[PDB]
Amino acid sequence: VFDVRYTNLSYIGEGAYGMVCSAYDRVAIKKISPFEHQTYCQRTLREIKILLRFRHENIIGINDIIRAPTIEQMKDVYIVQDLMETDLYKLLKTQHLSNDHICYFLYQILRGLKYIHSANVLHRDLKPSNLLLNTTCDLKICDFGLARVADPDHDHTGFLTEYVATRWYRAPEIMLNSKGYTKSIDIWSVGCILAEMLSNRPIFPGKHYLDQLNHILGILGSPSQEDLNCIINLKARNYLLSLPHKNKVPWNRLFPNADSKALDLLDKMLTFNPHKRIEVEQALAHPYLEQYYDPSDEPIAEAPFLDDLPKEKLKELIFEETARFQPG
Numbered sequence: 001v002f003d004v005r006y007t008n009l010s011y012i013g014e015g016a017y018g019m020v021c022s023a024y025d026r027v028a029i030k031k032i033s034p035f036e037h038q039t040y041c042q043r044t045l046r047e048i049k050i051l052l053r054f055r056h057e058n059i060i061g062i063n064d065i066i067r068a069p070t071i072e073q074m075k076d077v078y079i080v081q082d083l084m085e086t087d088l089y090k091l092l093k094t095q096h097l098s099n100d101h102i103c104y105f106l107y108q109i110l111r112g113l114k115y116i117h118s119a120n121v122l123h124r125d126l127k128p129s130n131l132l133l134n135t136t137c138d139l140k141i142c143d144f145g146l147a148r149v150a151d152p153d154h155d156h157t158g159f160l161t162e163y164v165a166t167r168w169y170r171a172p173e174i175m176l177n178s179k180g181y182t183k184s185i186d187i188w189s190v191g192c193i194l195a196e197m198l199s200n201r202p203i204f205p206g207k208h209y210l211d212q213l214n215h216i217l218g219i220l221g222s223p224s225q226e227d228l229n230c231i232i233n234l235k236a237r238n239y240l241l242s243l244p245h246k247n248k249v250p251w252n253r254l255f256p257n258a259d260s261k262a263l264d265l266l267d268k269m270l271t272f273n274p275h276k277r278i279e280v281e282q283a284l285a286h287p288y289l290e291q292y293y294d295p296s297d298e299p300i301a302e303a304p305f306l307d308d309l310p311k312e313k314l315k316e317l318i319f320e321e322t323a324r325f326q327p328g
């Protein structure tokens, strides 16, 4: 059932979120049915609240929202967004990208991320399938379902703490001492996306939770004494000290045909210690992106921007947040 002004539906894809179609206003329309679970309501409210406050060329917008006229009759919510042609995940299954496509797509990811981070927001699930593309090579970041307001003072957690965001794009600190409440979480994922664009393969394809950290240390090598000193947890320190010494796999052996400036930026985004990891503004200013770098054309948000609310209260908040799209 797709009850939506919008006609001639055509299937694009599906996932845990629900189903996404194309339709004539040509737009994208996704049907969300989250009201039976608190977690689904939280993700829906984050997506809506955030995307409605953001206005940026490299961030997907929300054009319209369809739902019943009362809270009692609201069972689904339809979100209308700009139609794109594909995503980076699908493109990388069939095309090897030239360096100048990688450079421009990376520029756009970091331009959008500058804006998100300037609003004090973390995306927390950056990956190729969340980067939408068209034939004119415009790139738009999507899926803010796991987004949060940054909170570096409460980022600390114990060793091997469970995490929801996509495993292959998790920074090493997620497995050691971090809840993913700092902007450095997103820079790591962007580093993983760059590596993936360079070889059409995920750089750190962990098969399970701790294997993710095995893959990261397998390439970066053993962390320095200084980086071990920044690790707060007794258990995380003991674990890292227990491992055999491993030397760093050089970027030019993993990526023998990549541009040397792309590999220098990659090295800086994939820095083990999050305190030493390059920030979004510094990455935009890196020599690899010099042809595109223009701070005057990299806008920021006008002002900065659930866990213990029951699903019923979250449904009322979603109802209120979507009220602006009703007739009159």
Ligand SMILES: CS[C@@]1(C(=O)Nc2ccc3[nH]nc(-c4ccc(F)cc4)c3c2)CCN(CC(=O)N2CCN(c3ccc(-c4ncccn4)cc3)CC2)C1
Pocket: 012, 016, 017, 018, 020, 028, 030, 032, 033, 034, 040, 041, 043, 044, 047, 060, 079, 081, 082, 083, 084, 085, 086, 087, 090, 129, 130, 132, 142, 143, 144, 145, 146
């Ligand atoms: C990256 S997929 C996405 C999206 O925005 N897609 C999208 C949005 C706009 C688009 N324009 N053009 C294309 C497109 C893409 C590829 C292609 F080949 C052609 C066109 C396109 C695709 C669709 C969903 N959206 C996130 C998103 O909408 N939200 C809200 C929902 N949320 C959620 C809610 C419920 C559940 C659940 N429910 C039941 C059982 C289990 N789980 C889980 C999660 C998650 C956060 C992200």
